[PDB]
């Protein structure tokens, strides 16, 4: 008969089922899906009704009703709100901030049921405040990109401070008492736009398929926020560059009229319309870097690359496949729905990068140029939590000062990284006993080469040592589960109230410093998507509904805990400690530990949360009970 080679037959089959994209769609490498149509996914990785065997599907990922609703908004291309979606009162109707804030609180119940259960930052009256704004850079949806300010970047702000004759603010930077930066000036470099070109998205009105002359513009800014970190451990915003353009000579850079959190000035924080605008512009900058870079690229897309490469090279039954496999549950169908609807029909629509909405060529669209560049400029090893916290300038290993008490991400993760490495170290070493044993493995070398080339993650290691294999496996797990968890499952809260953190601006920037300095509420109210005017209704809905959709809380069984308890691979409907091949006494002992380590950690993440400055919003996101096995939303 014809000769049968079980392995090479199975891999030949997987390399047909799991194929790469040619990249003509304008996305980083992913699983090839003809027109991203559900049907053209691999049979098992498709979607069934909720309460089904895993050989059928993965259960309805999103909330049926709020998908049909969000799809309704994306499809709605008419500038006149459709009869269906329209209501007597809406959270964008206003027409004032007061009226919009007043609506928000009246939608808190006792339907909207996530990890904050229908609640948002709108609960806090003083969300505008310097503490709550800045606190989002430690505890918000993007806690992982703030870093120590380069000495020669302080040198710029020392100069601009002097230029404005602000003698007080100069002395603060002069010495350099824990001066930190959050830098979105890279958006230009990232989109190939010149320093004379402004970010503008021209939203063309269509009569279904055919356009009418009518348009409305949304705007975006390569902002740069400068913070000082005090000893009591409060992150204080000092300065915002609204849109950085090579130098601060060519940009308009405002300074906080209160130079500390306790500072008192006769103009309040609520009435400081110049500063409340700047912060709102700096919020659009972080919305982008969060959704594109920190969320979509760094988690969803990096994980898909691993999934595809791992499936193509490493066979089902191999140890590496079995530890990684569970952390992929339903990731592929979700990215196929992101690439189809969410990225083009929402992200690229509500963002201010443009150049147009809708787009006919995504390779020409800037949101896609940013998606592409974010993937290209990711670094697999540098975002190892230890290496992450080190290079960004955070010594969590030994801070006696207690200055990082307001930074629970940095606290929670430094612990949680070692714990997941502990687990992997025990399981990997149960087969991979030496650097040599790794070197003489068939798949690990080709696994790396596949990821470094086709996956287009060159920063992925050439795995020689046992430590190198452990960190790589930790990272795949860390990215897929707790890192995605942190950045995914606080969207509803921080985005639901659109003014707190809006996706883009609905009016051009102020022309110069002198113009901004005399800004009224109506300017911000206009800049935000409020009123029946200029299709601002659609921008609000999408801005506050995508968060609620993607914040929809994880099911009990898709916990990191429930896995650590029983090692049950939800994704593959099997258990690793039922493969007589592997040294299972060890694996059961690693899992037994890993579980006791996580229960123990949930206690510490709690302490870190309540250990923050009085009033500071909680950080419950990395609670193992509320952490996802995979990138499953
Ligand atoms: Fe996500």
UniProtKB/TrEMBL annotation:
<feature type="binding site">
    <location>
        <position position="633"/>
    </location>
    <ligand>
        <name>Fe(2+)</name>
    </ligand>
</feature>
<feature type="binding site">
    <location>
        <position position="300"/>
    </location>
    <ligand>
        <name>Fe(2+)</name>
    </ligand>
</feature>
<protein>
    <recommendedName>
        <fullName>Manganese lipoxygenase</fullName>
        <ecNumber>1.13.11.45</ecNumber>
    </recommendedName>
</protein>
<feature type="binding site">
    <location>
        <position position="484"/>
    </location>
    <ligand>
        <name>Fe(2+)</name>
    </ligand>
</feature>
<keyword id="KW-0223">Dioxygenase</keyword>
<feature type="domain" description="Lipoxygenase">
    <location>
        <begin position="1"/>
        <end position="633"/>
    </location>
</feature>
<feature type="binding site">
    <location>
        <position position="295"/>
    </location>
    <ligand>
        <name>Fe(2+)</name>
    </ligand>
</feature>
<feature type="region of interest" description="Disordered">
    <location>
        <begin position="27"/>
        <end position="56"/>
    </location>
</feature>
<dbReference type="InterPro" id="IPR013819">
    <property type="entry name" value="LipOase_C"/>
</dbReference>
<dbReference type="InterPro" id="IPR036226">
    <property type="entry name" value="LipOase_C_sf"/>
</dbReference>
<dbReference type="InterPro" id="IPR000907">
    <property type="entry name" value="LipOase"/>
</dbReference>
<keyword id="KW-0479">Metal-binding</keyword>
<dbReference type="GO" id="GO:0043651">
    <property type="term" value="P:linoleic acid metabolic process"/>
</dbReference>
<dbReference type="Pfam" id="PF00305">
    <property type="entry name" value="Lipoxygenase"/>
</dbReference>
<feature type="binding site">
    <location>
        <position position="488"/>
    </location>
    <ligand>
        <name>Fe(2+)</name>
    </ligand>
</feature>
<dbReference type="GO" id="GO:0050584">
    <property type="term" value="F:linoleate 11-lipoxygenase activity"/>
</dbReference>
<keyword id="KW-0560">Oxidoreductase</keyword>
<keyword id="KW-0464">Manganese</keyword>
<dbReference type="GO" id="GO:0034440">
    <property type="term" value="P:lipid oxidation"/>
</dbReference>
<dbReference type="GO" id="GO:0046872">
    <property type="term" value="F:metal ion binding"/>
</dbReference>
């Amino acid at each position: 008969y014809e000769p049968i080679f079980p392995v090479k037959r199975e891999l030949d089959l997987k390399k047909r089922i799991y194929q790469w994209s040619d990249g003509t769609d304008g996305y980083p490498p992913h699983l090839k899906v003809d027109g991203n149509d559900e049907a053209n996914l691999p049979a098992d990785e498709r979607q069934s009704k909720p309460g089904s065997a895993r050989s059928e599907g993965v259960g309805q990922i999103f909330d049926m009703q709020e998908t049909a609703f969000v799809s309704k908004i994306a499809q709605a291309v008419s500038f006149i709100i459709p009869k269906d979606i329209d209501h007597e009162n809406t959270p964008y109707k206003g027409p004032t901030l007061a009226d919009v804030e007043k609506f928000n609180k009246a939608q808190f119940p006792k339907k909207a049921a996530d990890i904050m259960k229908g609640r948002n930052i709108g609960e806090y009256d003083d969300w505008y405040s310097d503490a709550r704004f800045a606190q989002q850079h430690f505890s918000g949806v993007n806690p992982s990109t703030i870093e120590t300010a380069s000495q020669d970047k302080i040198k710029e702000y020392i100069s601009e401070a002097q230029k404005q004759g602000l003698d007080k603010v100069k002395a603060i930077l002069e010495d350099g008492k824990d001066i930190l930066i959050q830098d979105y000036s890279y958006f230009r470099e990232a989109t190939g736009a010149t320093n004379e070109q402004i970010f503008q998205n021209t939203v063309y009105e269509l009569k279904g398929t055919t356009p009418t002359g009518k348009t409305t513009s949304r705007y975006a800014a390569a902002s740069v926020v400068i913070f000082q970190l005090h000893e009591d451990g409060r992150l204080h915003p000092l300065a915002i560059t609204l849109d950085y353009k090579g130098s601060l000579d060519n940009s308009i850079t405002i300074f906080n009229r209160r130079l500390s959190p306790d500072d008192t000035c006769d103009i309040a924080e609520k009435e400081d319309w110049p500063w409340r605008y700047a912060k709102t512009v700096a919020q659009t900058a972080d919305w982008a870097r969060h959704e594109v870079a920190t969320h979509l690229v760094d988690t969803h897309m990096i994980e898909e690359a691993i999934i595809v490469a791992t499936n193509r090279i490493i066979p089902e039954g191999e140890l590496l496949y079995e530890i990684l496999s569970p952390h992929w549950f339903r990731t592929l169908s979700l990215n196929a729905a992101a690439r189809k609807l969410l990225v083009p029909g929402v992200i690229a629509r509500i963002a201010g990068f443009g150049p147009t909405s809708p787009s006919l060529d995504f390779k020409g669209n800037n949101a896609f140029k940013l998606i592409d560049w974010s993937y290209k400029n990711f670094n697999f090893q540098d975002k190892y939590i230890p290496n992450d916290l080190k290079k960004r300038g955070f010594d969590i290993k030994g801070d006696k000062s207690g200055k990082y008490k307001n930074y629970p991400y940095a606290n929670d993760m430094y612990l949680l990284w070692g714990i997941i490495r502990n687990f992997v170290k025990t399981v990997i070493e149960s087969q991979y006993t030496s650097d040599h044993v790794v070197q003489k493995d068939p798949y690990i070398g080709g696994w790396c080469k596949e990821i470094q080339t086709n996956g287009q993650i060159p920063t992925f290691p050439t795995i020689t040592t046992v430590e190198q294999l452990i960190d790589a496996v930790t990272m795949c797990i860390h990215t897929a589960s707790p890192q995605h968890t942190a950045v995914n499952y606080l969207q509803d809260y921080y985005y639901s109230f659109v003014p707190a953190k809006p996706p883009a601006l609905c009016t051009p920037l102020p022309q110069d410093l002198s113009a901004l300095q005399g800004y009224t509420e109506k300017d911000l109210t206009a800049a935000l998507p409020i009123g029946t005017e200029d299709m601002k209704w659609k921008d609000w809905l999408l801005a506050a509904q995508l968060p609620e959709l993607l914040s929809y809380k994880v099911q009990q069984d898709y916990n990191l805990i429930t896995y650590a308890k029983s090692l049950y691979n939800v994704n593959k409907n099997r258990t690793i400690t039922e493969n007589t091949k592997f040294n299972c006494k060890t694996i059961k002992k690693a899992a037994a530990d890993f579980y006791s380590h996580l229960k123990s950690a949930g206690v510490e993440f709690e302490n870190y949360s309540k250990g923050q400055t009085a009033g500071t919003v909680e950080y419950p996101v990395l609670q193992p009970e509320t952490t996802a096995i995979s990138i499953l939303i």
